[PDB]
Design an enzyme around this catalytic site. Structure first.
Site, PDB file in Angstrom:
ATOM      1  N   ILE A  28       9.170  69.159  18.296  1.00 40.56           N
ATOM      2  CA  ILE A  28       9.472  68.509  17.030  1.00 40.56           C
ATOM      3  C   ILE A  28       8.230  68.340  16.157  1.00 40.56           C
ATOM      4  CG2 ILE A  28      10.513  66.537  15.922  1.00 40.56           C
ATOM      5  CD1 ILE A  28      12.554  67.249  17.648  1.00 40.56           C
ATOM      6  N   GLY A  29       7.083  68.271  16.808  1.00 43.53           N
ATOM      7  CA  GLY A  29       5.822  67.914  16.206  1.00 43.53           C
ATOM      8  C   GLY A  29       4.899  67.488  17.353  1.00 43.53           C
ATOM      9  N   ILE A  30       4.303  62.961  20.941  1.00 49.78           N
ATOM     10  CA  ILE A  30       5.421  63.357  20.092  1.00 49.78           C
ATOM     11  C   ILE A  30       6.206  64.503  20.726  1.00 49.78           C
ATOM     12  CG2 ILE A  30       5.997  64.237  17.802  1.00 49.78           C
ATOM     13  CD1 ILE A  30       4.424  62.320  16.598  1.00 49.78           C
ATOM     14  N   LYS A  46       6.088  62.491  25.179  1.00 49.71           N
ATOM     15  CA  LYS A  46       4.729  62.835  24.791  1.00 49.71           C
ATOM     16  C   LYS A  46       3.982  63.353  26.025  1.00 49.71           C
ATOM     17  CE  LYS A  46       3.139  58.035  24.807  1.00 49.71           C
ATOM     18  NZ  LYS A  46       3.835  56.730  24.608  1.00 49.71           N
ATOM     19  N   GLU A  84      12.014  56.170  24.741  1.00 51.96           N
ATOM     20  CA  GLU A  84      12.998  55.775  23.735  1.00 51.96           C
ATOM     21  C   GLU A  84      12.567  56.199  22.344  1.00 51.96           C
ATOM     22  OE1 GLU A  84      13.084  51.722  22.913  1.00 51.96           O
ATOM     23  OE2 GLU A  84      14.790  51.929  21.519  1.00 51.96           O
ATOM     24  N   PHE A  85      13.291  57.158  21.762  1.00 53.53           N
ATOM     25  CA  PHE A  85      12.880  57.695  20.469  1.00 53.53           C
ATOM     26  C   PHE A  85      13.625  57.039  19.311  1.00 53.53           C
ATOM     27  CE2 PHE A  85      12.585  60.846  16.920  1.00 53.53           C
ATOM     28  CZ  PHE A  85      11.274  60.512  16.632  1.00 53.53           C
ATOM     29  N   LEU A  86      12.889  56.842  18.215  1.00 57.21           N
ATOM     30  CA  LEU A  86      13.448  56.126  17.069  1.00 57.21           C
ATOM     31  C   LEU A  86      13.074  56.831  15.789  1.00 57.21           C
ATOM     32  CD1 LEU A  86      12.497  53.691  19.365  1.00 57.21           C
ATOM     33  CD2 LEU A  86      14.094  52.522  17.809  1.00 57.21           C
ATOM     34  N   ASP A 128      -4.197  45.570  20.495  1.00 56.11           N
ATOM     35  CA  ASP A 128      -4.240  46.420  19.312  1.00 56.11           C
ATOM     36  C   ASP A 128      -3.125  46.079  18.320  1.00 56.11           C
ATOM     37  OD1 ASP A 128      -4.352  49.970  18.464  1.00 56.11           O
ATOM     38  OD2 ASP A 128      -5.668  48.333  17.906  1.00 56.11           O
ATOM     39  N   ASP A 146       2.524  51.294  21.208  1.00 55.16           N
ATOM     40  CA  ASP A 146       1.180  51.713  21.467  1.00 55.16           C
ATOM     41  C   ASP A 146       0.362  50.804  22.382  1.00 55.16           C
ATOM     42  OD1 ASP A 146       1.357  53.436  18.505  1.00 55.16           O
ATOM     43  OD2 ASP A 146       0.259  54.227  20.234  1.00 55.16           O
TER      44      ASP A 146
END
Length: 273
Positions: A28-29, A30, A46, A84-86, A128, A146
């Site tokens: 897709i590009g 991650i 990833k 989990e992708f958003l 962070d 992250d």
């Protein structure tokens, strides 16, 4: 890198592979996105081929405000992480161009706090916290990302030099032992971000800034001209230089500033532009 430091790695990881149930991948590009034959959900991985801290530490945890890390594997020298992708982006694409309101602001704050509140008693610290580490669903729901910097804390105190200077805690920059209270100072700097758009000293090179963070009074708002006295009040409790006079997440939920948080829907039209 080393295959001995990868010795205490493999063990803490599921074996086999994801492409037993999962299949319809696509770069897709991650990296990737697959599908669940069982339902049809797609996931974003990833890949790859300390950082110790994400795998072990957060593999034991799950909150509705934290992008879920599903499973972990490796074939040969390569780690596979189901995640989990958003679709919905980070708060940085918002703060930088338009001006948020207290309803939207209040919603990012308590959202961020709902996480911290359990991550902390559970003995973990983000380290962070900033708009850049916040992701949104397409629908407008708010989560914390992250954990490339986290760590597990007898050992209730810490002192590692890490994070992003402009958001860092004075006690942390000052190499004075800190706890999770650092995560609390970071929220206020993200608050300055939501009101003015930038973190203080952001005109400065990071290091000198770290000096100016080090020996100036708590940072003040350049806006204020459109600032309800309640945002001051909340703001006024989180920007404490004495780590001990600094308010706690448990305290902050009970804060009247947070009477104004909006629903996901109330947040949606900010990404729509």
């Amino acid at each position: 890198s080393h295959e001995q430091f990868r010795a205490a790695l493999q063990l803490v990881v599921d074996p086999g592979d994801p492409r037993s149930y999962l299949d319809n991948f696509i770069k897709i590009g991650i990296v990737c996105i697959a599908t669940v034959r069982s339902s049809g959900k797609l996931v974003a991985v990833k890949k790859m081929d300390l950082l110790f801290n994400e795998v072990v530490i957060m593999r034991d945890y799950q909150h509705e405000n934290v992008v879920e890390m599903y499973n972990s594997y490796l074939v040969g020298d390569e780690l596979w992480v189901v995640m989990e992708f958003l679709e919905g982006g980070a708060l940085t694409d918002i703060v930088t161009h338009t001006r948020m309101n207290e309803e939207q602001i209040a919603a990012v704050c308590l959202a961020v706090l709902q996480a911290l509140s359990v991550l902390h008693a559970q003995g973990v610290i983000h380290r962070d916290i900033k708009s850049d580490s916040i992701l949104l669903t397409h629908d407008g729901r708010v989560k914390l990302s992250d954990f490339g910097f986290c760590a597990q804390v007898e050992v209730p105190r810490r002192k590692s030099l890490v994070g992003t200077p402009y958001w860092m805690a004075p006690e942390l920059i000052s190499r004075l032992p800190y706890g999770p209270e650092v995560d609390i100072w970071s929220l206020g700097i993200m608050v300055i971000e939501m009101v003015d758009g930038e973190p203080p000293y952001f005109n400065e090179p990071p290091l000198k800034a770290m000096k100016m963070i080090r020996d100036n009074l708590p940072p003040r708002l350049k806006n204020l001209h459109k600032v309800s006295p309640s945002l001051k009040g909340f703001l006024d409790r989180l920007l404490v230089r004495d780590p001990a006079q600094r308010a706690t997440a448990a305290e902050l939920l009970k804060h009247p500033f947070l009477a104004k948080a909006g629903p996901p829907a109330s947040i949606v039209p900010l990404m729509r532009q």
